[PDB]
Amino acid sequence: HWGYGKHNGPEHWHKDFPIAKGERQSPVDIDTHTAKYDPSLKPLSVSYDQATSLRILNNGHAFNVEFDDSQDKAVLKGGPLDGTYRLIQFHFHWGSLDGQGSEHTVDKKKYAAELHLVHWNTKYGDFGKAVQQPDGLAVLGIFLKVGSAKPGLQKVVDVLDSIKTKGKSADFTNFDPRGLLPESLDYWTYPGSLTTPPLLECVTWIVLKEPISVSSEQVLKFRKLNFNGEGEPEELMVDNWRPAQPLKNRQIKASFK
Ligand SMILES: [Zn+2]
Ligand SMILES: [Zn+2]
Ligand SMILES: [Zn+2]
Ligand SMILES: [Zn+2]
Ligand SMILES: [Zn+2]
Ligand SMILES: [Zn+2]
Ligand SMILES: [Zn+2]
Ligand SMILES: [Zn+2]
Ligand SMILES: [Zn+2]
């Protein structure tokens, strides 16, 4: 089983997942000197007011907050996107130390964590068919830095003790994802992949410029989770990020100057 450990980590994923060395892998370093502004990028439209959260779960790699995506309740439109992409889940990647944890980097700066709000293209009818396509998904990536507590994150933090180990889940209704956004929606964008196996090259990445602030007590709560299921040996869920991959023949476009 792939993982983030010594013998099953990112450097070994190519064995079972050869697309790991493909042409559009994520994440990537964003060099703010070469990611040039592009005036034709429309502004990004985020509609989360009717978001309906269902459950929260530890799948052994991170924890996902899943949403009802049966209808256009919470959607992302605009920017580089054609059409309408529905929110299906969010999750985070984070470090064992404050100086690392993000997947994307900005001029090689690593952040303490990165939020991924995952959305699929309604043009394909369901998530399962969307991930098979180049334009199947859009992931909105938000950096986290340590500082002041993020009130909107608290409901997440408070339930983490109930899903400590793999396979555990809890009911998780009425969570409002707008409480996880920064104030500004300026972004970079490029075409890439899922950052975990199976690493499909199906994602339009949209990463925000402005990070959110979370408290060290909030991030410590992330580091108390386990990769293992109950009654296996404890392996703390930390450093569940993949490092930057080669940009190859791709351009990263900025929405701001
Ligand atoms: Zn292990
Ligand atoms: Zn090899
Ligand atoms: Zn540079
Ligand atoms: Zn320069
Ligand atoms: Zn797994
Ligand atoms: Zn669904
Ligand atoms: Zn992710
Ligand atoms: Zn229930
Ligand atoms: Zn138990």
Curated annotation (Swiss-Prot):
InterPro entries xrefs: CA_dom, CA_dom_sf, Carbonic_anhydrase_a-class, Carbonic_anhydrase_a-class_CS
Family annotation (Gene3D superfamilies): Alpha carbonic anhydrase
Outcome (variant: residue 62 to F): Reduced activity
The entry's keywords: Acetylation, Cell membrane, Cytoplasm, Disease variant, Lyase, Membrane, Metal-binding, Osteopetrosis, Phosphoprotein, Zinc
Consequence when changing residue 103 to A/Q: Strongly reduced CO(2) hydrase activity
Consequence recorded when altering residue 62 to S: 2-fold decrease in enzyme efficiency, as determined by kcat/KM ratio, and efficiently inhibited by chlorzolamide
Residues annotated as the enzyme's active site: 61 (proton donor/acceptor)
Positions of the record's site feature: Fine-tunes the proton-transfer properties of H-64: 4, 59, 64
Subcellular location per the Swiss-Prot or TrEMBL entry: Cytoplasm; Cell membrane
GO molecular function, one term: arylesterase activity
Annotated family: Belongs to the alpha-carbonic anhydrase family.
Function: Catalyzes the reversible hydration of carbon dioxide. Can also hydrate cyanamide to urea. Stimulates the chloride-bicarbonate exchange activity of SLC26A6. Essential for bone resorption and osteoclast differentiation. Involved in the regulation of fluid secretion into the anterior chamber of the eye. Contributes to intracellular pH regulation in the duodenal upper villous epithelium during proton-coupled peptide absorption.
Protein name (database record): Carbonic anhydrase 2
Organism: Homo sapiens (Human)
